[PDB]
Amino acid sequence: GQSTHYLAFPRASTITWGDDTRYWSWATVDFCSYAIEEARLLQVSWLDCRWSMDASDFKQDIWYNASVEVMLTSNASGWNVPLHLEIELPDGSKQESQIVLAGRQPNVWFKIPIGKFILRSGTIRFGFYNHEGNWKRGLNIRTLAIQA
Amino acid sequence: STHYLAFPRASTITWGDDTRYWSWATVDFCSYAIEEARLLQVSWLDCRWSMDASDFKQDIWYNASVEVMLTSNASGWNVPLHLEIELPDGSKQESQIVLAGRQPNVWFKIPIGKFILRGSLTSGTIRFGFYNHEGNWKRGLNIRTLAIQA
Numbered sequence A: 001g002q003s004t005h006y007l008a009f010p011r012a013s014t015i016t017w018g019d020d021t022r023y024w025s026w027a028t029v030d031f032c033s034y035a036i037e038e039a040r041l042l043q044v045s046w047l048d049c050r051w052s053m054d055a056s057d058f059k060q061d062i063w064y065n066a067s068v069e070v071m072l073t074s075n076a077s078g079w080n081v082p083l084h085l086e087i088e089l090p091d092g093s094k095q096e097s098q099i100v101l102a103g104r105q106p107n108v109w110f111k112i113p114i115g116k117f118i119l120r121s122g123t124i125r126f127g128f129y130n131h132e133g134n135w136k137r138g139l140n141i142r143t144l145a146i147q148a
Numbered sequence B: 001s002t003h004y005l006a007f008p009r010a011s012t013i014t015w016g017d018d019t020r021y022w023s024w025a026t027v028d029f030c031s032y033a034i035e036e037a038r039l040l041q042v043s044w045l046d047c048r049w050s051m052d053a054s055d056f057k058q059d060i061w062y063n064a065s066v067e068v069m070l071t072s073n074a075s076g077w078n079v080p081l082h083l084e085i086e087l088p089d090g091s092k093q094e095s096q097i098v099l100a101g102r103q104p105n106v107w108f109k110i111p112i113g114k115f116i117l118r119g120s121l122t123s124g125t126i127r128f129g130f131y132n133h134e135g136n137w138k139r140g141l142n143i144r145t146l147a148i149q150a
């Protein structure tokens, strides 16, 4: 059946404004005996989180699925506009979908599916964004997961 | 801090797809389904992950470890288990460990080396893993994950 091949924690990603403590915080926690850092959004307007992995990390002729695991805080706001979800293949083609997070239950981890790919070479980009001029607040990011 | 975990389905293992030599066991890893690679017995022991240097950030010291468990059945571990990181320029971090006499049925993390990427080393394949190709038979090693930290 389907099992996880990789977990990529948000320190492996590029997060716009990620190093500015007005906008993002980083929190050290234990994940299954490994120290990780959650990326905790305080507030940002240009919300953009992208992991980049090469197509050579993966096997050929296999359907992969990706998800991002997040938590909304009690302070969540700005989620009335769709969060765009993307996988970008090396040729520039994209798997595009979206989710509206407004009104979702806070303080529970949930895994947002962000799409599927098959290889049948170069960079694959995984992640999510919303670039509208409103403030997004109160999303904590745990990990990207890639399964097959 | 941990940047990546790579589970053994993402590696290449000699005989790994032959149920006479290796079993794949579905377990939960803090809410993610993973499959442990459970060695029954093999003589050509070889497990390698490949990730591109572009997956990592430049000018950062990374360390890697493999998390394993010996079973009550373990044997053949008086030989050196070779541990390796091969960078895209062919340079290698090489070390070894003797697993004979280690306590079974607990996960333990074997450090396999450290690396930093600058200039042309920032692109091209990095190989991580372990091996022993001697004519003895190794038994009862279960592999959970490769971890890459910085």
Ligand SMILES: O=[N+]([O-])c1ccccc1
Binding pocket: B014, B044
């Ligand atoms: O790679 N090898 O030489 C090898 C492969 C399978 C069995 C024994 C030896």
